[PDB]
Structures are given as C-alpha cells and as structure tokens.
A = this chain, B = another copy of it.
Amino acid sequence: MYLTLQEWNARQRRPRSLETVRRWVRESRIFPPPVKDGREYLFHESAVKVDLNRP
C-alpha cells in the first residue's frame, strides 16, 4: 500500500501545504524517500519526516 502526496500529509501529526511536503522530498527529509510514479509521488505507509542534521 502506497499513499500519495496529499494522503500521506493528511495523516501526519500536523497537515501542511502540498508545496511544503514537496520541499522535504527534495531535501531528503522523508525517510524512506517516496517513489516516482507517473507524475505524483508515492510515500511508504510508515513514512515519517526526519531531521538529517546534528547541531
């Protein structure tokens, strides 16, 4: 089962903007990264945003 860009963001702790979610995908802030299918992205069921930074 693979959720879409909107469906995935509609299940997070706090729904954000479509363009915002698109930014994480480009910043690899989505583990695991979505898969390209057609024109939209397909995220994983247990997909959750992470922070690739160690201050």
A22 on the B face (CB < 8 A) = no
A2, A37, A49 pick with most chain B CB within 10 angstroms: A37
Cβ distance A33 to chain B, nearest Cβ, rounded Å: 12
What count of chain A residues pass the 8 Å CB interface test? 15
Cβ distance A40 to chain B, nearest Cβ, rounded Å: 7
Which chain B positions have C-beta within 8 A of A49? 37-38
Cα distance A40–B24 in the bound complex, in angstroms: 15
A51 on the B face (CB < 8 A) = yes
Cα distance A37–B35 in the bound complex, in angstroms: 22
Which chain B positions have C-beta within 8 A of A40? 14
Cα distance A52–B20 in the bound complex, in angstroms: 27
